[PDB]
């Protein structure tokens, strides 16, 4: 199995207990 | 009940940020923004107050005002931690025109619940006031956010500020010897070369969602870092399914799996925003007009919000990640 982040992707940082979202990102172009 | 509010708020805001420019990178901290607005609500009354709390997606029939503030106080304490694996910090502050009289209940509540002090500030010396605030944010974010405040009205009465900083090591770091320039497909037909980190024979939580045409993994304390990788041209479809229900199914469906190869770019990105339009769309309206009731701050309805700004930065590298964000709420006299 290969997981290749070579296309747009999302990242979400979630508080386990409260589900507060501490940070969220969509990377459409890492060279910005 | 608080969990449903937090996710609804984060995803509502996310979609609103995307709508303004659907192909741009997005980076933001939902909790930085909600903490700043909840802090403001400590001084709000009547419709100004109810609009703020409803805009943060709380339902005031399940959760009382006191329970909301208690949740932010607890959250603030969970986001100040240090270990060999992690550095987390979160702070709040108020910068206030020196001669402005504040109610003792407000400054007591602000320190106890939000950890906020009050800094006497001469906003009429705009350059000096901006430096004072930007330096506070620079200090809290370890130099990662340094220009949160660009323009600042010389007639400002107060600025409420939140910052958050998060630095973490990967459980399994990438070897920089295995980072190589590789294609990143902005679309099927548009691609650039980026430094692409790689790891082999990894065992990590994994879920292939054939229904949503995406793969979810977790790399890495007590926070879960979810990576969601839509198939090519499926990002818009995945965004359309984001919700508490979908996030729950992701977490429920993860299972450990040996992955042959993992490729993740090395990169740093930044975004900044003015959130007035979005907050008005979420129904937080009276706070921006002359009907604003922030009389819990001063004892008179003599303040209203002028500007809400947010900036956030994300850095991903072989050893781990660094994330930072800050929010400022600028307040004028009325």
From Swiss-Prot, chain B:
One of its GO terms (molecular function) is serine-type endopeptidase inhibitor activity. Keywords: Acute phase, Glycoprotein, Protease inhibitor, Secreted, Serine protease inhibitor, Signal. It comes from the Eukaryota. GO terms for cellular component: azurophil granule lumen; blood microparticle; collagen-containing extracellular matrix; extracellular exosome; extracellular region; extracellular space; nucleus; platelet alpha granule lumen. The reactive center loop (RCL) extends out from the body of the protein and directs binding to the target protease. The protease cleaves the serpin at the reactive site within the RCL, establishing a covalent linkage between the carboxyl group of the serpin reactive site and the serine hydroxyl of the protease. The resulting inactive serpin-protease complex is highly stable. Alpha-1-antichymotrypsin can bind DNA. Interacts with DNAJC1. This is Alpha-1-antichymotrypsin.
């Amino acid at each position: 199995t290969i997981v290749r982040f070579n296309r747009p992707f999302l990242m979400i940082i979630v508080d386990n207990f409260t589900w507060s979202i501490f940070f969220m990102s969509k990377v459409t172009n890492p060279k910005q | 009940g608080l969990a449903s509010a937090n996710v609804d708020f984060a995803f509502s805001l996310y979609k609103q940020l995307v709508l303004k420019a659907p192909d741009k990178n997005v980076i933001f901290s939902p909790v930085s923004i909600s903490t700043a607005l909840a802090f403001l609500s400590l001084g709000a009354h009547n419709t100004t107050l109810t609009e703020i709390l409803k805009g943060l997606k709380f339902n005031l029939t399940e959760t009382s005002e006191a329970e909301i503030h208690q949740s932010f106080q607890h959250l603030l304490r969970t986001l100040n931690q240090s270990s060999d694996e992690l550095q987390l910090s979160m702070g709040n502050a108020m910068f206030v025109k020196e001669q402005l009289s504040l109610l003792d209940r407000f400054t007591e509540d602000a320190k106890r619940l939000y950890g906020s002090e009050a800094f006497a500030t001469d906003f009429q010396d705009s350059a000096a006031a901006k430096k004072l605030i930007n330096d506070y944010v620079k200090n809290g974010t370890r130099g990662k956010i340094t220009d949160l405040i660009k323009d600042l009205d010389s007639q400002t009465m107060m600025v409420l500020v939140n910052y958050i900083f998060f630095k973490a090591k990967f459980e399994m770091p990438f070897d920089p010897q295995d980072t190589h320039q590789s294609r990143f497909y902005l679309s099927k037909k548009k691609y650039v070369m980026v430094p692409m980190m790689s790891l082999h024979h990894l065992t990590i939580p994994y879920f292939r969602d054939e229904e949503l045409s995406c793969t979810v993994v977790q790399l890495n304390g007590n926070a879960s870092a979810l990576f969601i990788l839509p198939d090519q041209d499926k990002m818009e479809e995945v965004e359309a399914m984001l919700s508490q229900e979908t996030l729950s199914r992701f977490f429920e469906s993860l299972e450990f799996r040996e992955i042959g190869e993992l490729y993740l770019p090395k990169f740093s990105i930044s975004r900044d925003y003015n959130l007035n339009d979005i907050l008005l769309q979420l129904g937080i309206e009276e706070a921006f007009t002359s009907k604003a009731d922030l009389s819990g701050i001063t004892g008179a309805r003599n303040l209203a919000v002028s500007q809400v700004v947010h900036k956030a930065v994300l850095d991903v590298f072989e050893e781990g990640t660094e994330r930072s964000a800050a929010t400022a709420l600028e307040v004028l006299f009325q």
